[PDB]
Amino acid sequence: TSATVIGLGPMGQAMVRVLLEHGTAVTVWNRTKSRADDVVARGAVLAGTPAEALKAAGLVILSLTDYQAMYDVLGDAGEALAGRVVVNLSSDTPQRTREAAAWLAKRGATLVAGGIMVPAPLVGAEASYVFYSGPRDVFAEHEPVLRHIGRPEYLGEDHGLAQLFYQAELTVFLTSLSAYLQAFALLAAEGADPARLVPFAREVSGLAASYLDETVSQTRARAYPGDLSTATMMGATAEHILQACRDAGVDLALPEAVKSQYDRAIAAGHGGDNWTSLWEVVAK
Amino acid sequence: TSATVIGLGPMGQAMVRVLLEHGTAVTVWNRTKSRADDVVARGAVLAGTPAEALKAAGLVILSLTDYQAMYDVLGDAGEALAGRVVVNLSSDTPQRTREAAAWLAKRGATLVAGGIMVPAPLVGAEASYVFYSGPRDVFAEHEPVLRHIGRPEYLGEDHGLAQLFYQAELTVFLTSLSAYLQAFALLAAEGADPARLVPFAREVSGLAASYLDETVSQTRARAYPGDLSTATMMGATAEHILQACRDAGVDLALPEAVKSQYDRAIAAGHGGDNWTSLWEVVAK
Amino acid sequence: TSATVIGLGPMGQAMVRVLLEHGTAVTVWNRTKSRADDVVARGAVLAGTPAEALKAAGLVILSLTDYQAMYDVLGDAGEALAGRVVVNLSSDTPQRTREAAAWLAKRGATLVAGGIMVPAPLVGAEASYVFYSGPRDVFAEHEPVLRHIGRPEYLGEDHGLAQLFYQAELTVFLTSLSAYLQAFALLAAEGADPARLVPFAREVSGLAASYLDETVSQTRARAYPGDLSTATMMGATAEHILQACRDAGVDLALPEAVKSQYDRAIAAGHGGDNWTSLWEVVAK
Amino acid sequence: TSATVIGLGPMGQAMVRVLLEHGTAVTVWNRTKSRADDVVARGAVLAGTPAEALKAAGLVILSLTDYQAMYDVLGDAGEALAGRVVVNLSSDTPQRTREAAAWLAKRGATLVAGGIMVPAPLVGAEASYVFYSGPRDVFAEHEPVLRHIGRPEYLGEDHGLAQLFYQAELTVFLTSLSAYLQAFALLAAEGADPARLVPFAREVSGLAASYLDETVSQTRARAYPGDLSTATMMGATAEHILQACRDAGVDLALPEAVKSQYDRAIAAGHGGDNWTSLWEVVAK
Ligand SMILES: NC(=O)C1=CN([C@@H]2O[C@H](COP(=O)(O)OP(=O)(O)OC[C@H]3O[C@@H](n4cnc5c(N)ncnc54)[C@H](OP(=O)(O)O)[C@@H]3O)[C@@H](O)[C@H]2O)C=CC1
Ligand SMILES: NC(=O)C1=CN([C@@H]2O[C@H](COP(=O)(O)OP(=O)(O)OC[C@H]3O[C@@H](n4cnc5c(N)ncnc54)[C@H](OP(=O)(O)O)[C@@H]3O)[C@@H](O)[C@H]2O)C=CC1
Ligand SMILES: NC(=O)C1=CN([C@@H]2O[C@H](COP(=O)(O)OP(=O)(O)OC[C@H]3O[C@@H](n4cnc5c(N)ncnc54)[C@H](OP(=O)(O)O)[C@@H]3O)[C@@H](O)[C@H]2O)C=CC1
Ligand SMILES: NC(=O)C1=CN([C@@H]2O[C@H](COP(=O)(O)OP(=O)(O)OC[C@H]3O[C@@H](n4cnc5c(N)ncnc54)[C@H](OP(=O)(O)O)[C@@H]3O)[C@@H](O)[C@H]2O)C=CC1
Ligand SMILES: [Ca+2]
Ligand SMILES: [Cl-]
Ligand SMILES: [Cl-]
């Protein structure tokens, strides 16, 4: 088996190592040639051109910052794309992923969209998994090589799906990281030591994740009983957080955005409903 | 022992039930007199007035929407407050909690401020804990009755500490819940079942929590090595979430707040730094 | 709108009340005529024959002990089945559900299989939901009446699906109830008071449910890292439970069945793997 | 303070890390000397022998697979055990724990038996609790060091009580995990994604737990009113699960154990009684 990896950021490099360690031949290409030194020392072959990289394998894995980078790198491949399977494991919108499917198809190439759901040090570890979407038959053929990156989670035929699931996951992940900075900033601005919060922040993240099922069922039902918590009570806290952040001279964007959800829910008559009623202002 | 509980939302009623379960004699008062029906049925005594409530015990627990509600309710209490310990377990700003301590002191009452870090159904469960701050010796005299609500975490003499930790905790909690709605809305808008995300969302919450220690070290050091993940790359995803939400007709408020942190960190020169460089734009 | 309910056990009766309360006309039939007294007093009409019951509505809800009961009651309906939608909300196997689909189809009737996921007192409450499977168009038409029973969870076209999900759910529910009896019996046989276990039994059920995601991912991956728990350590406890139950003179069936899973997993070389390796002996 | 921990599976290492984190001087011993690598790296002292371990502290914590392992390890300890407090937090039968107390006493050591009711990652977390039983005054002398592992639940003087509660708890826990595998296997065998069940499984676990109080009252009274749900009807479902599992080629061990309880209760005359009538066949 033979693989090409285009993009040697931390994830591209991690995927090259894991493919090499499992006895796949790896041809790499990278805009910044010098970034390939370590993977070539581990037995990767650096191609001179993306077209060359496309000629050294039927399986082409793209690990780039966005899908626009794919067009920058592959725009000049011409017929070297014909019959290749492009596994794009890059962040972008569902719509640009679908668009890339059509662009690649015009040039005889098959897109399998994917999203890796771990950081680089966990690539190929037990806890690694990857969303995939695009043609089942084409994915199935390459699945035996791809599964070394992580557990494949094939979502279906719509190329946008893997990217949809990636952006949904990253909405949770990135906003959580911004909530941690927000929390530590409030403490640090008030003279308190953010380190003291760590064990409680871990507990309340555990508590938050435990609400996922209630969230699913109430939003799915559009039923929001306020018996244990009201949008008025939780909006009051959203406001206390915003005010406390204003008092402490800390950024206001995140707490303001959360508060706006409760205000617009209450203004819509959901003051007495569960926080899950914010569905009514958030959803399409 | 004797206790008064003022405010009978789900948390007040839960605290009353737990104190009754441990043989505490509990006097209650509520604005909406019907909400007392359940704790009166379990043998709580409904006081006619807040002053009558206060006279019932040395120990007075407030579970109200905010500290304004304290003033609306105990505003005309006067003499009833003298010699009493007011354990205020209501959401508000650290500053308003500190000013409340002053106001209470003038009327010969001590404030212990606190924050309950679990919902009503977990009051008195293994997982329950409560931040407390204020005069150590007063907290300690009442702690054997207070402990029935949850493990007491006494933070110190500053009345605003318990409130500060509670607000920082609810910054994590409320923002996480909103990120869950946001992820579910994106899926639902594109016609996928939000319930499909549930186990992956819980997993990515676990992953997010595992970054807490290195967030503390990097933000305190203002050291942001970008070798595993840059603000540019994660910023790119923050923009992808915003755009995908824009494409699907979902509310952009929360994704826009998170993207504005990356925008600002990058424009402040942290493009090649870790996401922890957002400290530079969040912490002032 | 018009509905027929055949079967006036607690669930049939609960569904009749909820349909009446939402302004649906209800015709009932029951083997035991006298069981209809309360629903007729609430405005249900008792039909003399199942054929009559079939003539008083296009929507026919079956709430019987099994699918064999359906054949007992409807076997003598002849052409009175033609064009009816039979919503069977009865326990049976996926295969007999599919078989009933064909039997009903031969007689011009459409089956929508369902399973109600709450006891009778929660029928029509916020927390009620019902699995449905069978023809989407036919289900969609009746969904506006059926949704009063609980949140419809339409799983797809295969009639067996709702029943599959019901039996899967009930595997969790019934085996949990048998584990509670098993636990209380051990305590009661040893002189201890089962009532003392209740708060800990609630905690450990919460703990158990928290392992659902790990279960999904490891069995899905067929990856069972034993870093936090081995099948040898957990099989040792399964054995201690069986022995303790033998020492106390309490039934052995449940603890023996659990122990057999770990023995067969260890015998297969999974002594050092996670308990999730029992997948390898349990799964098809 | 000083502590010895004998046994370095995940629970032993977790207890060592938590005691070290609180400034306890910890001596360790393990059969597989490599497992000590991690706690030695955090500054635990590796004793050459178990007798050397015991000499290091008045307080000796055992975290072994079973009480046989205690005998294999402390079998030749002899004089080293005199005056020492052995806090044995290992799974075994109440009888073997009681006989262990006798054996230890002869050698001039006190036993405190216990059971940790959370996994290794939650040792020292808010949710952690530990049953203890044995001499009150000895437990109490050591409880300030022991409390760092989790909230101490002292059950009384009988050394077999902590073990009895632990085994009853793990009857609930292990049987629930196996019921989860069983539900997932049924889905997987019929070609449905087990991940689809996850939120409904968690919900039905919640529902099961809500029956705990009425299980206590009905089983103690041997009063089993069948008006909401009969053993015949629930027995029918136990048989449906068994048959559906039989049809799908899934292991029948666990469904057969549960069905045998209904079979036996019905044949003992409880067909029209609540499922709680299974007490009559489980409790002897
Ligand atoms: N890092 C992580 O933890 C994870 C990241 N991801 C996703 O994986 C992808 C890769 O991320 P990561 O490995 O962090 O690396 P980066 O996104 O920081 O960089 C990846 C590669 O993109 C290349 N690149 C970007 N723009 C262009 C362009 N216009 N033309 C040519 N090459 C370009 C870079 O080239 P050069 O080296 O020359 O700069 C580099 O090789 C992203 O889509 C990201 O969202 C997914 C999960 C985990
Ligand atoms: N619910 C939860 O899960 C948790 C809540 N909390 C905090 O606990 C506190 C209580 O919350 P919760 O139990 O949910 O209930 P709510 O905040 O919805 O209501 C609590 C009480 O506040 C009273 N109240 C509000 N405003 C006034 C006012 N101006 N004058 C008089 N009484 C007033 C209500 O009176 P009335 O009955 O007449 O409406 C009610 O008795 C809040 O500060 C909240 O942040 C913290 C942790 C968990
Ligand atoms: N009870 C509950 O909590 C729940 C039950 N279910 C399911 O709903 C269904 C109904 O259960 P439930 O309401 O408890 O009642 P039962 O299963 O105890 O009885 C329901 C009805 O079945 C009838 N019946 C059974 N066998 C025959 C037969 N051969 N011929 C004619 N009628 C027959 C009974 O007739 P008669 O009255 O004359 O005896 C009764 O009307 C079952 O499939 C059950 O698994 C689902 C979720 C919750
Ligand atoms: N893991 C968990 O989540 C929980 C476990 N428990 C209980 O805690 C105890 C420890 O469990 P856990 O940490 O998972 O680890 P294990 O039970 O897998 O192993 C614990 C220790 O037992 C030692 N051991 C086993 N048999 C012998 C023997 N005959 N002679 C000498 N040493 C022996 C092992 O030595 P070696 O290292 O050489 O193999 C190891 O150090 C068990 O009783 C378990 O039921 C309770 C709650 C939670
Ligand atoms: Ca606790
Ligand atoms: Cl506690
Ligand atoms: Cl504690």
Automatic annotation (TrEMBL), chains A, B, C, D:
Domain NADPH-dependent reductive aminase-like C-terminal: from-to ranges: 158-283
Going by the UniProt record, its keywords in alphabetical order are: Calcium, Metal-binding, Nucleotide-binding, Oxidoreductase
Per its UniProt entry, which superkingdom is the organism in? Bacteria
SUPFAM superfamilies this protein is in? 6-phosphogluconate dehydrogenase C-terminal domain-like, NAD(P)-binding Rossmann-fold domains
- Provide the GO MF annotations for this entry: NADP binding; oxidoreductase activity
Q: Binding of NADP(+): at which residues?
A: L8, G9, M11, N30, R31, T32, R35, L64, T65, D72, S91, Y166, L228
Q: Name one Pfam family in it.
A: RedAm-like_C
Coiled-coil-forming residues are none
Indicate which residues the UniProt annotation says bind NADPH. Answer: L8, M11, N30, R31, T32, R35, L64, T65, D72, S91, L228
Q: Does the keyword Mitochondrion apply?
A: no
Q: Where does the 6-phosphogluconate dehydrogenase NADP-binding domain lie? A: 4-151
Protein residues bound to Ca(2+): E126
- UniProt keyword Oxidoreductase, yes or no: yes
The UniProt similarity line reads:
Belongs to the HIBADH-related family.
Name of the molecule in the record: 3-hydroxyisobutyrate dehydrogenase-like beta-hydroxyacid dehydrogenase
What is the species listed in this Swiss-Prot or TrEMBL entry? Answer: Amycolatopsis thermoflava
